[PDB]
């Protein structure tokens, strides 16, 4: 039905194809071998009728997961069930673990924090499920730009949402987030100022061992209008816009940084027609808070 | 269908192997045929020789070439006997199973699985014991 529903259907088909035995795929997903499948009549689990021929599976686009993220499951744990089923696959299956991308996990964190609201459970799952990703020779899933930055933004808005003046636990959250990263794509430099904003908000000295002290380097977003490319253009730096707005709202001093403001207005122009993701996120958080 | 002096196979473990029909029981004209599932009077024309290794041989066989016995025709080679569903089944060789004169239950204890196909009409006539014993009922 909705984009999420079709995305779930395609993802389930992708998973089932990549979870079958290697010697059984040629007899199931290859149409020419339909007669062979009918004749052999393999015994499937749960003592049911032998499998019927199935259409072949082609590589899946990230937009399907993005749609599935953008689908609304405010009080439904479907996101948690899908993550569990996806993370339970064998390490050797490269396709399943190579479909996950930094934008994907960043979107999971964002949707979990605003729309689903139960950010605690999803962040616990994602942070806990890291060793298997590392064994899957896929450490780039966790990066400063997408994973760590989104986590810091969620921490900022969580502190804003619920008052917590216990600085020690906040420092522990920051330290665990810092150690959980693997690829360390610290290029925009927003992480350093985000941690400074967290320190000012709570009152603890920023501390990020090994952090690269790069300044704010946000490339200029063109204000031109295009078709599907424009959609991507905004989404490309949408998170960046979310980070900038959270910094501006939480930190009053953030108005000093003119680069963040320049990025904001550029994005705004490039997005004047459509609704602001930041305001929409706040409205969804407020509506779904109860 | 079989008539007087029609040699027909026996597919029971009662020792008898070949039998020759002498009469049809539930028929008026002796020249009428014997269909699948009607009692017939047979005289055995071939039997398996008997041994004496086991004292008090079981009365399952009690068959010697020449003895008179009653049987039920279980399968036939005729190809036009139509059923209600419209299908027709024709076998390769006719066969029968010996049954007791009075009680009606078969002499044998188990039909042999290698030649144990029986027409399904026999079940509708009420011969549940033969159908249950038969390996496959077509």
């Amino acid at each position: 039905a909705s984009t999420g529903e079709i995305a779930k259907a395609k993802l389930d088909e992708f998973l089932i194809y990549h979870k079958t035995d290697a010697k059984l795929k040629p007899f199931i997903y290859r149409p020419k071998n339909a007669q062979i499948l009918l004749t052999k009549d393999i015994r499937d689990p749960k003592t049911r009728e032998p499998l019927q021929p199935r259409p072949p599976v082609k590589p899946l686009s990230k937009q399907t997961l993005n749609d599935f993220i953008y689908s609304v499951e405010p009080n439904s744990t479907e996101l948690l069930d899908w993550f569990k089923e996806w993370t339970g696959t064998s390490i050797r299956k490269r396709a399943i673990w190579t479909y996950i991308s930094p934008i994907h996990v960043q979107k999971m964190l964002t949707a979990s924090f605003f729309k689903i609201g139960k950010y605690a459970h999803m962040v616990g799952l994602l942070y806990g499920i890291e060793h298997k990703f590392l064994k899957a020779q896929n450490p780039s899933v966790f990066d400063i730009e997408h994973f760590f930055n989104t986590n810091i933004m969620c921490a900022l808005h969580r502190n804003r949402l619920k008052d917590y003046k216990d600085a020690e636990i906040a420092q522990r959250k920051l330290q665990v987030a810092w150690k959980k990263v693997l690829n360390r794509k610290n290029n925009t430099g927003l992480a350093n100022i985000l941690v400074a904003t967290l320190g000012r908000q709570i009152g603890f000295t920023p501390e990020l061992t090994g952090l690269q002290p790069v300044d704010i380097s946000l490339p200029d977003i063109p204000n031109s209008s295009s078709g599907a490319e424009l959609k991507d253009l905004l989404s490309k730096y949408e998170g960046i816009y979310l980070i900038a707005r959270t910094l501006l709202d939480i930190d009053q001093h953030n108005a000093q940084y003119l680069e963040l403001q320049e990025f904001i207005r550029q994005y705004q122009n490039a997005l004047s027609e459509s609704s602001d993701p930041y305001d929409t996120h706040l409205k969804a958080l407020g509506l779904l808070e109860t | 269908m079989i008539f007087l002096k029609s040699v027909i196979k026996v597919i029971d473990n009662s020792g008898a192997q070949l039998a020759e029909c002498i009469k049809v029981i539930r028929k008026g004209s002796p020249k009428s045929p014997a269909m699948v599932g009607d009692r017939i009077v047979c005289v055995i024309q071939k039997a398996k020789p008997l041994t004496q290794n086991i004292t008090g041989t079981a009365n399952t066989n009690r068959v010697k070439k020449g003895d008179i016995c009653h049987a039920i025709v279980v399968r036939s080679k005729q190809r036009n006997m139509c059923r209600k569903d419209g299908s027709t089944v024709a076998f390769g060789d006719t066969a029968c199973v010996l049954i007791n004169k009075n009680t009606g239950e078969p002499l044998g204890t188990r039909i042999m699985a290698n030649d144990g196909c029986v027409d399904r009409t026999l079940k509708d006539k009420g011969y549940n014991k033969i159908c249950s014993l038969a390996s496959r009922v077509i």
Binding site: - | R79, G86, D115, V137, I138
Partner: protein
């Protein structure tokens, strides 16, 4: 079923095919049967068309004729396509010869 034996369809049942007539469980308590097509009887009326099937179960040969349009069969599926060496339209001549059907069920397993 008309397209299963349609004369204009290449992939139609012909003499030499081996089929498994499936009997509707709900409508009847029959059992599935496997046989070798000896003849496909076609009559002026479409409904009264039947298949003649042979199978040598163990040491007994069983011929069965089944109305193809009876409401007691849900589907007739093909197991082994016919060979391109038998030279006739109805294979009545295979009985008793070395070309006979033999035991189909055992060969499948």
């Amino acid at each position: 079923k008309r397209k299963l034996i349609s004369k204009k369809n290449k992939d139609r049942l012909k003499a030499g095919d081996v089929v498994r007539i499936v009997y509707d469980s709900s409508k009847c308590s029959y059992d599935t049967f496997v046989g070798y097509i000896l003849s496909i009887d076609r009559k002026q009326l479409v409904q009264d068309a039947s298949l003649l099937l042979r199978n040598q179960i163990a040491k007994t040969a069983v011929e069965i004729r089944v109305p193809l349009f009876s409401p007691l069969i849900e589907r007739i599926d093909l197991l082994t396509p016919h060979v391109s060496s038998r030279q006739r339209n109805k294979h009545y001549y295979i009985r008793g010869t070395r070309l006979d059907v033999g035991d189909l069920e055992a060969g499948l397993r």
